[PDB]
Design a protein around this nucleic acid. Sequence first.
RNA 1: AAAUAUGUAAGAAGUCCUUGUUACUUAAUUGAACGUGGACAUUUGAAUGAAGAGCUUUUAGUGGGCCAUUUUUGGUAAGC
RNA 2: GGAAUACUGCCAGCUGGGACUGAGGACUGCGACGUAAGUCAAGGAUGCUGGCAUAAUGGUUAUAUGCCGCCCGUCUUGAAACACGGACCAAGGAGUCUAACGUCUAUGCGAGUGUUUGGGUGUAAAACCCAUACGCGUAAUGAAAGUGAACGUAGGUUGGGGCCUCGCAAGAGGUGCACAAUCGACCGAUCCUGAUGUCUUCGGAUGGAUUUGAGUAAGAGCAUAGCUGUUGGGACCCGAAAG
RNA 3: GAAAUUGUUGAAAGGGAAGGGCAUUUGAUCAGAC
Lengths: 167, 222, 185, 51, 148, 53
Amino acid sequence: TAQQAPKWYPSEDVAAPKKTRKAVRPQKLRASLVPGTVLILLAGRFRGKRVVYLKHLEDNTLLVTGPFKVNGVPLRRVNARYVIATSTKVSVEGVNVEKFNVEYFAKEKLTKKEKKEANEIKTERVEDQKVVDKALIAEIKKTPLLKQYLSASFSLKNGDKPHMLKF
Amino acid sequence: AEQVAAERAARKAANKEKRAIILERNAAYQKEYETAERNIIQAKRDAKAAGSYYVEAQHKLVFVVRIKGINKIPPKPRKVLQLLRLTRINSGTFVKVTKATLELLKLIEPYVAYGYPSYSTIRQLVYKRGFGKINKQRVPLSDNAIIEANLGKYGILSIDDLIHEIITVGPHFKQANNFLWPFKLSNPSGGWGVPRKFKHFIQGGSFGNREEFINKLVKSMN
Amino acid sequence: GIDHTSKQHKRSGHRTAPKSDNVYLKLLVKLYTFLARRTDAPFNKVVLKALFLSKINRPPVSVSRIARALKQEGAANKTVVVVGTVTDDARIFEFPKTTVAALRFTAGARAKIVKAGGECITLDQLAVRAPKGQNTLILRGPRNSREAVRHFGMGPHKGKAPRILSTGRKFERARGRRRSKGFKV
Amino acid sequence: VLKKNPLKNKQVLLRLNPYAKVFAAEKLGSKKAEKTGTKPAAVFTETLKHD
Amino acid sequence: PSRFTKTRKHRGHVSAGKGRIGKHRKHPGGRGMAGGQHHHRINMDKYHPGYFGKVGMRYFHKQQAHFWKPVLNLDKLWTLIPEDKRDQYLKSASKETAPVIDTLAAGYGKILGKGRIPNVPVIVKARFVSKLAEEKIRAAGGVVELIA
Amino acid sequence: RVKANAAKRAEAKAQGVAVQLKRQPAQPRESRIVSTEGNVPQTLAPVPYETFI
RNA sequence: AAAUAUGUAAGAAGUCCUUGUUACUUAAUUGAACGUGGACAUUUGAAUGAAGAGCUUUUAGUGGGCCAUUUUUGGUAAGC
RNA sequence: GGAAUACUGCCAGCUGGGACUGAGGACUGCGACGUAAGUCAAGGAUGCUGGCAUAAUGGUUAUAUGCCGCCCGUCUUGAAACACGGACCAAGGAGUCUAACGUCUAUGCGAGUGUUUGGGUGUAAAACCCAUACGCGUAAUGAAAGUGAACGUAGGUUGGGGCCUCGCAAGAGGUGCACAAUCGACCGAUCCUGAUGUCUUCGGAUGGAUUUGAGUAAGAGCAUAGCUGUUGGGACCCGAAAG
RNA sequence: GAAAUUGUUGAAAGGGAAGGGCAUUUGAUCAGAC
């Protein structure tokens, strides 16, 4: 023998973990987040764009729309800690929004075999945007220059200080 | 012998009555702590309104914190520091004010900061940093039964009762204080308040008797 | 840092787990460390500690001390247990009947108590008869009888047995030991 | 296995003090004292204002 | 054996357990028994009182056979009697049958009265005996028979 | 001290009052009221310098 | 005639009561020492602490020291 | 005359932001809210989601940058030293063995102990067996001639682990080994004393003594082995001027 | 068929030494896991 033996052997069985005492409780959004608020996105494809906060989804995310007709941002979900809540409010009442949920945004996970070398939209998500925007653009028209404000991109200028700015 | 609900219902009943007994004595100390705290306040008005001066009772209890490190200390102060169990910097101990304890405090003045502690300071210390000497082992209190099995001889049954024997120096203060492990405090949160520590408090330093300013110092340490 | 009031990492200074590699003694210790743990009887504490002890702390108990032990008031029926060795004393020509528990008996002692109507037993048989040491008594042999203790501590004016190879006249019985020849001690 | 602290972790506080529940619900920490209208003697005020 | 001595543990360490200031040297205090009445006096006086001088008178041509007189104590007096041949004498204190114990055949020149023989009468044949030894044998009922 | 110590216990056992035969050190003082009838405070000030020689 | 230092005591091996011994002592069962019998136990005889306490054997290295505040001698002084 | 504010202190008053950590691994414990069921932030992290699944993280190594880093060993109060040795590398290189010993330890037998000088025998320098002897211990104290270890349950008093009885328990009484202190008894020696008596000079009874021993007072020893220390030895290695 | 020491090729750094430590960037290389 090259190595003799160990006299004793650790048990191969696994131990069940103890009883965890961490319940799951609903997230408490900050007070500045009210449905209908205009949000300034901070990251992603649409960083710096302005969008309208519609609904609080159950997985801690915020349902949001551009509207798509105004700035080209569709019905998305974003995280509350990647947006800035502005003081501008757009009346969201009269918008059918309860149909969207987590199951609505399913990615149809791709396998490892389907490795794309170099390189569409799902059928009825182009009419849901139209249905919501129709009730939302009408509310936009009430405030002058509001439709222009949503169509612009936020940016920090030379000499502005976020710790002093207001949104 | 089912032995899963017979004695369990017995132990729960014995637990409820202990929680019950603990409740009145906490309530009992409250009127006792309120009444006395208002007597000296009111006895001061009577003296001033009667053209006299109310000389309050001399303080019976001091809290002592070791200020100096463990190096370069002459024999006599080092022995007295050990007899109060202050064997490292930022350590705490309650000392009963008596002639045989005052002369110990003078010998150690360049190395300690002490004063008269209030209820809030002492209550917070035991709750956060109170440890009992359990068979020569430093044990977090964390339960009333731990004090019960160790200080139940003298009528002490709870962590709140233990604080009572400290602030009002009772017949069993010696055992009660001895049971309390010496307090390991950290440095003050806001600093020491002075540029140089090892001068007397009267001389702009840290060591000596700071009669009520120990509460501010210990709370920053606690 | 800490100002230590006592030396750090000081071992107990007591002997546990006797250093002899005898397998049988280890089994005896194992039986009595379990017994002292779980019986709450001071007798099994003593025997377990005594099983640790060294040879000079186990002086040989003789059958005469056993006889004197049994002549104590109300002790002639108690079981005698010796943690050590039992030797024979040909200086007594009578003997009682009492049984003895010990590690090792001599042949003369084994012959002696057996002849006198007794029965010599081991320490485990004691356990299955006296788990709490009922009706027993511990006998310890004379520790200070060894020839080395006579020499311990010698100096002036205490008479403590100089180390010496050959004794007699003209062997350190001279100046220093008398006033006629210099000072005495 | 882990020291949890009173003065926070209200659950631990109630474990060590059954009186904490009624101490809080009665607001004994912000209790008010009955007013009194006694005033110092004339000798006291002159001594305090003495040169 | 060599693998257990502290020489194996003093490898790598300079002085080898002898000190840096002391500097273990050949014979720093003299060889053998030097300095007895000199720098080593305190040691000799505390441990060897009597090491110098003389005490008595000389004796030429000593052979240790004239003083040969091995001692048998009166405590035993019975290991000489055979073991299985003993108990019938101790139980029967019979006269005109008492045993003869020839100490010389055992190899003992003297008998001394250490103590407490059983009261059975016995005859002892001894070169020499102690005074208290002789009547203790005789008070039991026996007699000592001088032999040469 | 033994005589009084033995005497106090003997008298105490007739009623059992826990006579407390031990000795105590000098305790901190307790409260009192000092009154100023005819004892009105008089104010003292530091004195200036003089040579006196 | 200080200060700082330094010895002793703060009990059970103590206190109290009665009386047995003796070749010592006294005019004297007078004392001295040692005992017999009885009474006083957890505030049992100040404080604080105790990390265990008491004890023994053996053996190493060391036996050139030097510095600081205070006291102090020689020296004008000195990293003397 | 009526308020406020400051300052100091208290609340088992409420609440926002940031950072580090997630040890433990079925339940038991303490709690809290609830009529109950049950739930929990209550004796230590879980739930949801994304990207990648590859040198991407990570290891190694080389370099760069920020900060830091004086040459090792030696004597020494004090070394980086303008104190000494060392240009570099390999191989060798210095506390051993023996006779006799001290303490401690382990093993056997035990008032004994030790086969191995030698004898028998042998598978042959081994293993196995054996008498007489012999050393050490069981007896010491005196220069010696000599004498020679119990008034007594082998003593009393005190403290004692363990044990026994009563006691729910606390405690009480009894027995008390080893050991500690102490006082008594015994053996030997020195200084006394001097009995019956008798080769009238022998013998030494008995009672003593601020004298003394490396003694007794129900034996512990003998053997072999080991670490450490000692003496003699070349004596850890290397080193004279000499005779 | 070692080391000191040397040649060739390859890589890297170098404003009065070089070598070292903590940390990371960069370059080279690499184990595990899937």
